[PDB]
Design a binder for this molecule. Structure first.
Ligand code: NA
Ligand code: NA
Lengths: 604, 604
């Protein structure tokens, strides 16, 4: 069968045999199935009996598949990658959508509450078919390889009486003593949020609590959070739009270290956006947002947002699912971590099924999850109390102020690679490129580049005072050779990290459905006071390249992830990049090469 | 194939070929399918476009079959007797139970609301499987031969939040301006009652009204009528028990002539009874009750029973379904009838599936509906105001009184054969047996008897004053020959009509599962004042024999129906019967022979 040589120019990839491009763009350090398509992650839980962390995801549009980890770095497939629960039962004859797990449930077994689907199609833009989405229970008695459906109807057969929902799915089970105290619930009551919205009103999270010890009945507590149709946090700059429908709602509570039941309450959601006029059955904008809020009561409970942002700025990033990972788990016991909230963002492989022409049968897989991320409250001290710091409707807020110093402490969402995964990514070969200051325009090669498309690059960029309000662009050119290059840079004129993919892939010239549009995410660098002098915040950059999967992290509070589908074997060189407009000081750049095998017990 | 000769003794009927006993016991003037089993009647409606009255019934445990009538005497099968709606859809993958029809519904078409079943088994005596019974919509666009299910989920997906129901089925749609005025509903609002009960509380009718013009949402109005588990009207003499579960609830309103929207409100129900201790999945008592009541409001509406009885006293009579038949219908236009409420009682053919051994495959049919019955308010004037008239918790009530005459007017439920059916039953040959008074004991042959097992017998029995409190038994012996006889008599010692079936069938000697136990129904004959003298009420008796189907009517307010499965061709003779205890005066007895063919367009 056919010979592949990545030093030779590519054909139209649609002409190659099935499976011939299996390895071409495939990551080694990310969660994705053995083959085929990955959809929304869900079902994650820690098994209290074994300590193993279980992860799950929709697989091939035909149910939920799953894997375990004892270290939060590497994974073991359950049921050989085949689905632990499939459609075709009485409650879910057409489909299985997201569900979440009560780890210590019916008979002390993991108990899945999930969206069972009986009628398609389903979309916020069209009229809703009554009973199309219900919430049903299943239980695993075999260690999470098979979830057996209860032989009864759904436990939540529909939305509240006469509600004209846009959607009613993705039930997310969670505990919270702040809710308990506000609602006089029994201690350690399980809550469920269901995500969707209302036609002619707008997106919403529907809130419930268990009524009975049996998980059979769920008492409706109201739309604890809802926003008008296509409205937006602030003026729309820092947290996209609330848009036409909420999906994949997660609810959890954080402090400075990780997860805390008494901590500040957060939610992550997908929003489904669109231009006007609306194109039937099309969601053109898939925003992956996080939201901080205060929960109060005046009859019924409300979640009132006080700041919001993106969990990942990638066009193709969406549908994140996360779970409490307790300190007692196997991974946390090995690493000494406190209680955490670990979230896996989904990276759709085909633009949410809008990449017609992509050589899908050649690759024989579609999509990945991003690296597990730890979520925590992040504080930014010694920020200069000016208009940059004080902007309303943004992704941070002032929590204290020092009139004498002229400073504020800021608060925002901390987003970083989970620690055991980060350390396993840095495990191999390790070299440093010298710091330097650049004033003129162009790319300057590193003295040494990684020899393969599997690396981490870490660097600090320091900008001088004149950078503010200039047309400066500075960063790195990666995955470069004669025929290809990808540029990642910060741009002050629109306060953004940009990924320029115009030259990323030689395959995009010969083949349809290989996207080359720019990716972008907003990032403000504040003014800070250190050693008694005022300066622009250091841009602390971490780039993880995993064959075709690029994740760009910054300052412990920013992520932008995308596909970088470079063809040529030589497209591995790294250079400094600066457009010449002002100057920039690069610290020493660390490069770690090779990453690690996240699936050590797989063949491929 | 085998020769049948009804002058020769029967074999064990279980040894004969399949279908060989098709005609043996089969009626000609009753509603039953072309072959196979009949279950609960339902689905009846008048088509406003054609004027045809449609009847329906469960058929072979596999959906609802239907037929039409233009005269309320004869019927035409729809869809050749095959079901107009079957199980195996998304909402009803396991079964279809009773439903009722809004005649002028979605797109002005007949619209069925019915119980769609997803989980079996279902019974009041066991724990209820969540979601086993829902209420779904279907619509017929082809004149009632096929009801197309709406391609959506159920419109009532379950009982109210956390209710531990015994049952939740048999939705009965009805209109009522008395309810409209009490509830401030829109004029001509459709109501639905659903029948069942609650574990640890008792049987109930759950009441709803349409929320929207679309029939999509049904607003819950409470348990408008409920009774404690296994309680009873009065002391249990005149209306059985309310028992452990209500089934087949009908609601309607009557005056003296027939149906009236502003009239007195009535309901008919089956009750499921049992001995203590309860045998799992067994209902041993199937009572077919009617109930009169007043409807009032104190927050939510209540139906408060003021009298109750049996619609039919037959052990095997149950599950009646009826419908408003307007004066504008085809049958009513021909007969000049006002608005009516026509009810068909079910006569189970096999003791509600407890007649093991019966030669079912030999007969190739099971069960029938009884003759259509007109329900109306019946007044009994000039009754002597004594303790017989004044008994509480009975099947009548005093509505006015005359202190001077020493009398009361009574009110009760009028039950008679629908008029066009009655006239078609009397259509043929017609002869009279002379009146006589009998004082000694024994049977006295009629001078002429009918030559076949298809006849109506009408007679008046007048009892002298000494009959009261005596051990008198008087009536008729029918279907008699050397080897067989059936006796129908009134008995003062327990105020009952009795059917003695001990000698009815020679087949019961040779064959299993042919019931020969006595049937009974309570009937009080009041003291009346006529021509200025006091007397025992005339017993006005009507017996309709339709091969094996016996229906006994009395005084326009009593029905007792049963199976009389006589074998020998000669078992057709009629005699007077009197046990000698006192005396009895028989008026002239009318006998009409042959009845009529209720299925003129069938082969068999
Ligand atoms: Na996105
Ligand atoms: Na009965």
């Amino acid at each position: 069968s056919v010979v592949i040589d990545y030093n030779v120019a590519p054909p139209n990839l649609s002409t190659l045999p099935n499976g011939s491009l299996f390895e071409t763009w495939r990551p080694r350090a990310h969660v994705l199935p053995p083959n085929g398509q990955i959809g929304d992650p869900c079902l994650h839980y820690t098994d209290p009996a074994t300590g193993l962390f279980h992860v799950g995801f929709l697989h091939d549009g035909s149910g939920i598949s799953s894997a375990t980890t004892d270290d939060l770095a590497t994974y073991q497939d359950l049921n050989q990658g085949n689905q632990v629960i499939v459609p075709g039962g009485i409650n879910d004859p057409v489909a299985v959508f997201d569900g979440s797990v009560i780890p210590n449930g019916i008979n002390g077994l993991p108990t899945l509450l999930y969206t069972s689907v009986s009628y398609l199609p389903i979309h916020w833009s069209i009229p809703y078919t009554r009973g199309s989405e219900t919430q049903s229970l299943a239980v695993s008695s075999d260690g999470g390889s098979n979830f057996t459906k209860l032989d009864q109807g759904p436990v939540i057969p529909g939305p509240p009486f006469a509600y004209n929902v846009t959607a009613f799915r993705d039930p997310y089970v969670f505990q919270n003593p702040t809710l308990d105290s506000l609602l006089h619930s029994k201690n350690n009551t399980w809550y469920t949020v269901i995500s969707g919205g209302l036609h002619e009103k707008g997106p919403a999270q529907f809130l419930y609590r268990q009524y009975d010890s049996d998980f059979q009945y769920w008492e409706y507590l109201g739309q604890w959070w809802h926003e008008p149709t296509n409205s937006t946090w602030g003026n729309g700059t820092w947290a996209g739009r609330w848009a036409f429908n909420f999906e994949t709602g997660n609810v959890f509570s954080l402090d400075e270290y990780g997860y805390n039941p008494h901590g500040q309450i957060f939610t992550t959601i997908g929003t489904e956006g669109s231009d006007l006029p609306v194109v039937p059955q099309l969601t053109s904008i898939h925003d992956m947002l996080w939201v901080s809020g205060t929960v109060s009561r005046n009859g019924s409970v409300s979640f009132n947002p006080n700041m919001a942002g993106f969990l990942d700025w990638g066009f193709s990033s969406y549908a994140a699912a996360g779970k409490v990972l307790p300190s007692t788990s196997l991974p946390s016991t090995k690493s000494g971590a406190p209680d955490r909230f670990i979230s896996y963002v989904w990276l759709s492989g085909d633009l949410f099924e809008q990449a017609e022409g992509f050589p899908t049968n050649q690759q024989n897989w579609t999509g990945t999850l991003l690296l597990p991320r730890e979520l925590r409250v992040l504080y930014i001290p010694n920020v200069v109390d000016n208009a940059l710091a004080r902007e309303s409707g943004a992704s941070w807020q002032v929590v204290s102020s020092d009139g004498s110093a002229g400073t504020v402490e800021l608060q925002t969402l901390g987003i970083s690679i989970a620690r055991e995964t980060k350390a396993a990514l840095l495990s191999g070969t390790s070299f440093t490129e010298s710091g330097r200051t650049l004033n003129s325009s162009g790319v300057v090669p590193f003295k040494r580049s990684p020899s393969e498309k599997f690396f981490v690059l870490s660097a600090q960029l320091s900008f001088p005072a004149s950078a503010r309000g200039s047309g400066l662009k500075s960063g790195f050119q990666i995955l470069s050779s004669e025929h290809e290059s990808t540029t990642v840079y910060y741009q002050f004129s629109n306060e953004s990290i940009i990924v320029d993919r115009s030259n990323t892939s030689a395959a995009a010239r010969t083949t349809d459905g290989i996207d080359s549009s720019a990716e972008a995410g907003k990032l403000r660098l504040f003014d800070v006071l250190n050693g008694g002098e005022q300066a622009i915040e250091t841009l602390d950059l971490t780039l993880v390249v995993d064959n075709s999967v690029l994740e760009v992290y910054a300052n412990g509070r920013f992520a932008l992830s995308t596909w970088v589908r470079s063809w040529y074997a030589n497209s591995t060189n790294i250079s400094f990049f600066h457009n010449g407009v002002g100057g920039v000081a690069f610290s020493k750049v660390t490069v770690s090469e090779g990453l690690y095998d996240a699936w050590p017990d797989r063949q491929y």
